[PDB]
């Protein structure tokens, strides 16, 4: 039933929206990291080391 | 049996000569018993000032009404007697005078065109008669909601510039243009380097050149002379004009971004894109089944009486967008669907639809250039704008190059996050606020 | 010789994706820089806080 | 140098189908199927059927769906059109050279395999109302439609547009009946531009071998005369005054065509005084207000209508008609110079040759010719036929108008528009 969305037009539409989908993924990840002050990632950002000891 | 590709090569070369004048003389030879001949001039309302505006149009009204050699109706009498047709137009950039005649009548046709273009009488009694004729044509043009919105679109998009002005000019200019104003226009503008003698049909080029040397000699051949202007560039402004008139049964809306000029290579890909959006009218076969999503939805949901895409070109600027005609309760929906299609093409043009757009352009170009008259117009206009005739094989190469990536880059350059010019005339209460039109020029998901 | 506003538009503001990415990267770096300054302004105004606490610690 | 032109190729089949092709080595091709199926072939029981047919060309067929026709044509940037006169329907198809086969297949499916599905037929009926309303916003369309109903008892009396009472009432069976009766080999001509003659001939033998229809070319159009008068108050009076002239292809028709150009057809000059137009100058003498006049010439398989058409101010309608009628009377009485006939012959000859310049005009000319005459006549023999019209033939044609039982149609404010009677 979802055979409908398989064909060269739909592959091209996938290719067009992929830099946008991944850039939104970048917005979400940096957004979640910022909002929770997330430890694992934010120790590794070379300014923003305002824990130190 | 020949291919499309072979057939384009078999279309014969446009021959071009230049006179000592500066007058370019150019032809496409065919088999036809008939021809179109004409003079194309780099003159129009873009060349005119506030005081001058409407002069070229006034000259158009006088051009056929007597010369020094054929006074009064004598030119009319000669054109009619040979079964010929004599016509004229003035755009913002270009004036043209042309004869449809029998090929055997090419010597007198060239003779008459030279007599019109150089030796126009402008008899004071005739100028007075034409005054009342032009004013009535203004009263007439007022009833054409299409002509009105396009004048409004130019007047708002080009604001403080000579491209803001109509061809026909304001009514006060019509009533106070003297013979001396017109003589000065003709002196400044009807100069041999700024004019092209074009022909298409059953003629040799040599014969056209000989007649050009006979009849067009000594326009400029000691003169040309001081004070010319070149065209200053015309500032585009993102703006709105709203002529609210509820007495009128249907709304007219025209919306455009800044196009590039005549010269610019990405006119071709913009036209591919415009063909994809297409045109519609309520008398088309195919409601639901039409390829264009604007056309399909406008037909299904009854959004529309008509729409059209346009790419109007001037030197170094243009008007690129769309015009539509609809019911008072349909303007908001029409705009949403129009803008969504621009946004769709900018971001996510697929390949199949681009091929359709390409094919529609290939068909449009070949269908247009069919007859002595459209080919002659194409010679005259092309030599003014491009300097060459761009052959059909070249246009083909330019169309073939366009794919989905080209459509999406080229659309983004002109449409994406750009300030449109908007003109509205009629029952336009439901016409979206400009801020909300502006917000339609980008997508938040992209 | 083109403007910095023009470059900030062209590279970052045109796509809503990159526009949002600019603000979120912008907000993280701003939170650090604003808090660091606003502490240091408040600290310079006051000076009887635990500026004193050299007295009582380190003896331990 | 261009290529030296190919000649037109022409074939009558034993079944009566004509095939005509030209190879002008052009980037686009044009195919027309021309059929003796115009509105004259309607009777009282089925008026407007050919209107609804003209509007039904992208509906579902046996070989292609409605959707396929629209999308497949548009994919290659093609066109499908139907042009109707009172005598003919003409199904035309344009595409680039490489795309002829898909457009041919669609053309064949529209004309020989239409399904007229009840629901697709029903959904289409409101298009009759739209198409009529758009056409009838020119006052000329209502006048010429009334003019024919006034003129004819019969068949040429039929409107091109569906009668209002019939909108919603034209049935699938009537459409099926119209195609079966009229879209047959003996009533048909296949015309191609920028396709080979063998490819057309192959199409015609394989796909256009139909007969169980009707014997040919009319009920016979009974000229009658009379008047229709439509009060409008419409600022301008539009009037048309006519008599029975000559059937197309007769030598007499050529005399009528020359007479038309003596009297004056359209304008030649943008904004001109129409100096060599006999009707215009005669009206202009005693009428100082805005007006128009033209000679009207409509020639058919078995009849013709000739006279004149006037646009004028309501109060000036009588003056304009009478001035125009008297100017024809002057020509009937013998007041016609040889220079006038020679100028009028020049306008005819140039007008015709210009009419066949485009692919569009050439194909319509070749199609109509094939239906009316069963032949192709080259431009130089059309021009020879024009030349053979003597001054006396032009006088005689004008005499037939003056003495002939009249037909009249008028729309506007009619308080000053006369009544045949009063002319």
UniProtKB/Swiss-Prot annotation, chain A:
**Principal subcellular localization:** mitochondrion
Q: Which UniProt keywords apply?
A: Electron transport, Membrane, Mitochondrion, Mitochondrion inner membrane, Respiratory chain, Transmembrane, Transmembrane helix, Transport
Bilayer-spanning residue ranges = 13-35
Name any Gene Ontology BP term: mitochondrial electron transport, ubiquinol to cytochrome c
Q: Tell me the compartments it is located in.
A: Mitochondrion inner membrane
A GO cellular component annotation in the UniProt record: respiratory chain complex III
Mapped to this chain, the residue ranges on the Mitochondrial matrix side of the membrane are 1-12
Q: How does it assemble?
A: Component of the ubiquinol-cytochrome c oxidoreductase (cytochrome b-c1 complex, complex III, CIII), a multisubunit enzyme composed of 11 subunits. The complex is composed of 3 respiratory subunits cytochrome b, cytochrome c1 and Rieske protein UQCRFS1, 2 core protein subunits UQCRC1/QCR1 and UQCRC2/QCR2, and 6 low-molecular weight protein subunits UQCRH/QCR6, UQCRB/QCR7, UQCRQ/QCR8, UQCR10/QCR9, UQCR11/QCR10 and subunit 9, the cleavage product of Rieske protein UQCRFS1.
Q: What is this protein called?
A: Cytochrome b-c1 complex subunit 10
Topology, Mitochondrial intermembrane side:
36-53
In the bilayer, the protein is annotated as: Single-pass membrane protein
In which domain of life is the source organism classified? Eukaryota
Any one Pfam family match given in the protein's UniProt record, by short name:
UCR_6-4kD
Q: What role does this protein play?
A: Component of the ubiquinol-cytochrome c oxidoreductase, a multisubunit transmembrane complex that is part of the mitochondrial electron transport chain which drives oxidative phosphorylation.
InterPro entries documented for this protein: Single_a-helix_sf, UQCR
From Swiss-Prot, chain B:
From what superkingdom does this record's organism come? Eukaryota
Positions bearing Phosphoserine = 178
List every position bearing N6-succinyllysine.
129
Instruction: Say if the entry is tagged with keyword Membrane.
Output: yes
GO molecular function terms listed in the Swiss-Prot or TrEMBL record: metal ion binding
The terms describing its cellular component in GO are:
mitochondrial inner membrane; mitochondrion
Which one Pfam family would you cite for this protein?
Peptidase_M16_C
Spell out the InterPro entries in the cross-references. Metalloenz_LuxS/M16, MPP/UQCRC_Complex, Pept_M16_N, Peptidase_M16_C
Assigned keywords, A-Z:
Acetylation, Electron transport, Membrane, Mitochondrion, Mitochondrion inner membrane, Phosphoprotein, Respiratory chain, Transit peptide, Transport
Q: Answer whether the UniProt record assigns the keyword Acetylation to this protein.
A: yes
Q: Where in the cell is it found?
A: Mitochondrion inner membrane
- What is the residue range of the signal peptide feature? none
Membrane topology (UniProt): Peripheral membrane protein
Modified residues annotated as N6-acetyllysine in this record:
77, 104, 129, 214
> Its quaternary structure?
Component of the ubiquinol-cytochrome c oxidoreductase (cytochrome b-c1 complex, complex III, CIII), a multisubunit enzyme composed of 11 subunits. The complex is composed of 3 respiratory subunits cytochrome b, cytochrome c1 and Rieske protein UQCRFS1, 2 core protein subunits UQCRC1/QCR1 and UQCRC2/QCR2, and 6 low-molecular weight protein subunits UQCRH/QCR6, UQCRB/QCR7, UQCRQ/QCR8, UQCR10/QCR9, UQCR11/QCR10 and subunit 9, the cleavage product of Rieske protein UQCRFS1.
Summarizing the function annotation, the protein's role is:
Component of the ubiquinol-cytochrome c oxidoreductase, a multisubunit transmembrane complex that is part of the mitochondrial electron transport chain which drives oxidative phosphorylation.
Q: Which family does it belong to?
A: Belongs to the peptidase M16 family. UQCRC1/QCR1 subfamily.
Its recorded name reads: Cytochrome b-c1 complex subunit 1, mitochondrial
Curated annotation (Swiss-Prot), chain C:
Name the gene behind this protein: UQCR10
User: According to the lineage, what is the superkingdom?
Assistant: Eukaryota
Q: How does it assemble?
A: Component of the ubiquinol-cytochrome c oxidoreductase (cytochrome b-c1 complex, complex III, CIII), a multisubunit enzyme composed of 11 subunits. The complex is composed of 3 respiratory subunits cytochrome b, cytochrome c1 and Rieske protein UQCRFS1, 2 core protein subunits UQCRC1/QCR1 and UQCRC2/QCR2, and 6 low-molecular weight protein subunits UQCRH/QCR6, UQCRB/QCR7, UQCRQ/QCR8, UQCR10/QCR9, UQCR11/QCR10 and subunit 9, the cleavage product of Rieske protein UQCRFS1.
Name of the protein this chain belongs to? Cytochrome b-c1 complex subunit 9
Annotated compartments: Mitochondrion inner membrane
Q: Which residues lie on this side of the membrane: Mitochondrial intermembrane?
A: 46-60
What GO terms fall under cellular component here?
mitochondrial inner membrane; respiratory chain complex III
Q: Which InterPro entries match?
A: QCR9, QCR9_sf
Residues passing through the membrane, by range: 20-45
Its keywords, alphabetically, are: Electron transport, Membrane, Mitochondrion, Mitochondrion inner membrane, Respiratory chain, Transmembrane, Transmembrane helix, Transport
- Record family assignment: Belongs to the UQCR10/QCR9 family.
Q: Which organism is it from?
A: Bos taurus
Q: What does this protein do?
A: Component of the ubiquinol-cytochrome c oxidoreductase, a multisubunit transmembrane complex that is part of the mitochondrial electron transport chain which drives oxidative phosphorylation.
Annotated GO biological process: mitochondrial electron transport, ubiquinol to cytochrome c
The UniProt entry, under PANTHER family, shows: CYTOCHROME B-C1 COMPLEX SUBUNIT 9, UBIQUINOL-CYTOCHROME C REDUCTASE COMPLEX, SUBUNIT X
Mitochondrial matrix face of the membrane: 1-19
Q: How does it sit in the membrane?
A: Single-pass membrane protein
Q: Which Gene3D superfamilies match?
A: Cytochrome b-c1 complex subunit 9 (1.20.5.260)
UniProtKB/Swiss-Prot annotation, chain D:
Please state the protein's primary subcellular location: mitochondrion
**Compartment(s) of residence:** Mitochondrion inner membrane
Would the keyword Electron transport turn up in this protein's UniProt record?
yes
Topology in the lipid bilayer is annotated as: Peripheral membrane protein
One GO MF annotation is:
metal ion binding
Give the UniProt entry's GO cellular component terms. mitochondrial inner membrane; mitochondrion
Q: Which InterPro entries match?
A: Metalloenz_LuxS/M16, MPP/UQCRC_Complex, Pept_M16_N, Pept_M16_Zn_BS, Peptidase_M16_C
Q: Where are the transmembrane segments?
A: none
- The reply to whether ATP-binding figures as a keyword in the UniProt entry is no
Pfam families reported for this sequence: Peptidase_M16, Peptidase_M16_C
Which residues does this entry mark as bearing N6-acetyllysine? 36, 169, 220
The record's PROSITE patterns line, in alphabetical order, gives: INSULINASE
Gene Ontology BP, a term: proteolysis
Q: Which UniProt keywords apply?
A: Acetylation, Electron transport, Membrane, Mitochondrion, Mitochondrion inner membrane, Respiratory chain, Transit peptide, Transport
Q: How does it assemble?
A: Component of the ubiquinol-cytochrome c oxidoreductase (cytochrome b-c1 complex, complex III, CIII), a multisubunit enzyme composed of 11 subunits. The complex is composed of 3 respiratory subunits cytochrome b, cytochrome c1 and Rieske protein UQCRFS1, 2 core protein subunits UQCRC1/QCR1 and UQCRC2/QCR2, and 6 low-molecular weight protein subunits UQCRH/QCR6, UQCRB/QCR7, UQCRQ/QCR8, UQCR10/QCR9, UQCR11/QCR10 and subunit 9, the cleavage product of Rieske protein UQCRFS1.
Purpose:
Component of the ubiquinol-cytochrome c oxidoreductase, a multisubunit transmembrane complex that is part of the mitochondrial electron transport chain which drives oxidative phosphorylation.
Q: Which family does it belong to?
A: Belongs to the peptidase M16 family. UQCRC2/QCR2 subfamily.
Q: What is this protein called?
A: Cytochrome b-c1 complex subunit 2, mitochondrial
Organism from which the protein derives: Bos taurus (Bovine)
- What gene does this protein come from? UQCRC2
């Amino acid at each position: 039933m979802l055979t409908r969305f398989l064909g060269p037009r739909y592959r091209q539409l996938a290719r067009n929206w992929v830099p946008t989908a991944s850039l939104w993924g970048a917005v979400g990840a940096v957004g979640l990291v910022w909002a929770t002050d997330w430890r694992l990632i934010l120790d590794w950002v070379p300014y923003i080391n305002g824990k130190f000891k | 049996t020949a291919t499309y590709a072979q057939a384009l090569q078999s279309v014969p070369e446009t021959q071009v000569s230049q006179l000592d004048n500066g007058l370019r003389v150019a032809s496409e030879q065919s088999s036809q018993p008939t021809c179109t001949v004409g003079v194309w001039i780099d003159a129009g309302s873009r060349y005119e000032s506030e005081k001058n505006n409407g002069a070229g149009y006034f000259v158009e009204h006088l051009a056929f009404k007597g010369t020094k050699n054929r006074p009064g109706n004598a030119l009319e009498k000669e054109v009619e007697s040979m079964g010929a047709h004599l016509n004229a137009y003035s755009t913002r950039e270009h004036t043209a005078y042309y004869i449809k005649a029998l090929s055997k009548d090419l010597p007198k046709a060239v003779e008459l065109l030279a007599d019109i273009v150089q030796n126009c009488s402008l008899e004071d009694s005739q100028i007075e008669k034409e005054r009342d004729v032009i004013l009535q044509e203004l009263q007439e043009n007022d009833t054409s909601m299409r002509d009105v919105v396009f004048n409004y679109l130019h007047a708002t998009a080009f604001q403080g510039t000579p491209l803001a002005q109509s061809v026909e000019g304001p009514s006060e200019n019509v009533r106070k243009l003297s013979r001396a104003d017109l003589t000065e226009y003709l002196s400044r503008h009807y100069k041999a380097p700024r004019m092209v003698l074009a022909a298409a049909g059953g003629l040799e080029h040599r014969q056209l050149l000989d007649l050009a040397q006979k009849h067009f000699s000594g326009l400029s051949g000691t003169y040309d002379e001081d004070a010319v202007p070149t065209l200053s560039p015309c500032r585009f402004t993102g703006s709105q004009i709203c002529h609210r008139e509820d007495g009128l049964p249907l709304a007219h809306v025209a919306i455009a971004v800044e196009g590039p000029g005549w010269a610019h290579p990405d006119n071709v890909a913009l036209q591919v894109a415009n063909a994809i959006i297409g045109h519609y009218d309520c008398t088309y076969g195919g409601g639901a089944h039409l390829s264009s999503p604007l056309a399909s939805i406008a037909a299904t949901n009854k959004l529309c009486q008509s729409f059209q895409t346009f790419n109007i070109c001037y030197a170094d600027t243009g008007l690129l967008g769309a015009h539509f005609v609809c019911d008072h309760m349909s303007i908001d929906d029409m705009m949403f669907v129009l803008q969504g299609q621009w946004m769709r093409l900018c971001t996510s043009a697929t390949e199949s639809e681009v091929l359709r757009g390409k094919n529609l352009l290939r068909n449009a170009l070949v269908s247009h250039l069919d007859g002595t008259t459209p080919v002659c117009e194409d010679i005259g206009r092309s030599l003014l704008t491009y300097g060459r005739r761009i052959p059909l094989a070249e246009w083909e190469s330019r169309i073939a190059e366009v794919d989905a990536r080209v459509v999406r880059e080229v659309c983004s350059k002109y449409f994406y996050d750009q300030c449109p010019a908007v003109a509205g005339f009629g029952p336009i209460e439901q016409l979206p606020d400009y801020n909300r039109i502006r917000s339609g020029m980008f997508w938040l998901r992209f | 010789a083109p403007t910095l506003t023009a470059r900030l538009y062209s590279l970052l503001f045109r796509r809503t994706s990159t526009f949002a990415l600019t603000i979120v990267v912008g907000a993280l770096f701003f939170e650090r820089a604003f808090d660091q300054g606003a502490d240091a302004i408040y600290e310079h105004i006051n000076e009887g806080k635990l500026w004193k606490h050299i007295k009582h610690k380190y003896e331990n | 140098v261009p290529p030296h032109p190919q000649d037109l190729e022409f074939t009558r089949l034993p079944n009566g189908l004509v095939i005509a092709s030209l190879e002008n080595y052009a980037p686009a091709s044009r195919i027309g199927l021309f059929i003796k199926a115009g509105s004259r072939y309607e009777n009282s029981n089925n008026l407007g059927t050919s209107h609804l047919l003209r509007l039904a060309s992208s509906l579902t067929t046996k070989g292609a769906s409605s959707f396929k026709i629209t999308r497949g044509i548009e994919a290659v940037g093609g066109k499908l059109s139907v042009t109707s006169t009172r005598e003919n329907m003409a199904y035309t198809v344009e595409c680039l050279r490489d795309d002829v086969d898909i457009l041919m297949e669609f053309l064949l499916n529209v004309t020989t395999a239409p399904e007229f599905r009840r629901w697709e037929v029903a959904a289409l009926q409101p298009q009759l109302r739209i198409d009529k309303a758009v056409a009838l916003q020119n006052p000329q369309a209502h006048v010429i439609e009334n003019l024919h109903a006034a003129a004819y008892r019969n068949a040429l009396a039929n409107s091109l547009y569906c009668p209002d009472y019939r909108i919603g009432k034209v049935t699938p069976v009537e459409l099926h009946d119209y195609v079966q009766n009229h879209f047959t080999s003996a009533r048909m001509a296949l015309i191609g531009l920028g396709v080979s003659h063998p490819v057309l001939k192959q199409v015609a033998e394989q796909f256009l071998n139909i007969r169980g229809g009707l014997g040919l070319s009319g009920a016979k159009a009974k000229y009658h005369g009379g008047e229709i008068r439509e009060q409008n108050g419409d600022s301008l009076v539009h009037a048309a005054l006519v008599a029975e002239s000559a059937a197309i292809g007769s030598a007499e028709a050529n005399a009528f065509s020359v007479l038309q150009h003596v009297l004056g057809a359209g304008p030649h000059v943008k904004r001109g005084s129409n100096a060599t137009s006999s009707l215009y100058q005669a009206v202009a003498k005693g009428v100082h207000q805005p007006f128009d006049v033209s000679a009207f010439n409509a020639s058919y398989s078995d009849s013709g209508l000739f006279g004149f058409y006037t646009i004028s101010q309501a109060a000036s309608a009588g003056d304009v008609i009478k001035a125009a009628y008297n100017q024809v009377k002057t020509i009937a009485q013998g007041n016609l110079s040889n220079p006038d006939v020679q100028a009028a012959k020049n306008k005819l000859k140039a007008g015709y040759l210009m009419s066949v310049e485009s692919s569009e005009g050439f194909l319509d000319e070749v199609g109509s010719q094939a239906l009316a005459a069963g032949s192709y006549t080259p431009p130089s023999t059309v021009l020879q036929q024009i030349d053979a019209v003597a001054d006396a033939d032009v006088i005689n044609a004008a005499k037939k108008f003056v003495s002939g039982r009249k037909s009249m149609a008028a729309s506007g404010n009619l308080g000053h528009t006369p009544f045949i009677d009063e002319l």
